Amino acid sequence: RHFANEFINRIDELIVFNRLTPSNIRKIVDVRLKEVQERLDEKQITLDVDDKAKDLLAQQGFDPVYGA
Amino acid sequence: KTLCVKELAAFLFNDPGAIVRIDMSEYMEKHAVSRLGQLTEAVRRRPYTVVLFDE
Numbered sequence: 337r338h339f340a341n342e343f344i345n346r347i348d349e350l351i352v353f354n355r356l357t358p359s360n361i362r363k364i365v366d367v368r369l370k371e372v373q374e375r376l377d378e379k380q381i382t383l384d385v386d387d388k389a390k391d392l393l394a395q396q397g398f399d400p401v402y403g404a
Numbered sequence: 405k406t407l408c409v410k411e412l413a414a415f416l417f418n419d420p421g422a423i424v425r426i427d428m429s430e431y432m433e434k435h436a437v438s439r440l441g442q443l444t445e446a447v448r449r450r451p452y453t454v455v456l457f458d459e
Contacts, residue, residue, distance in 0.1 A: 342458055
């Protein structure tokens, strides 16, 4: 309704993003740990995360009205 | 209402393009007779075109 009736027809796909579910929060911190390990490889520093650090940061970083 | 306009220009003029699209969704003022100008200069380059009025 904000644009025109002929402008919405030229768009190929109308991908609508959804809300970040609490079950997908565990997979969010798994991506951030990859960027940290690749930066410490030049200094020969191995970073390891147990199964307790990812669970605590998942329940505290949940913010649906702002995202990640 | 849209495919029929492109069909007339592709047969009577042998050109799929060169379609003057004038949207009236924004020209809703008393001073809209001076900016249309846009319609007078759109057909000046090619006198054998089509005119479309959307909304």
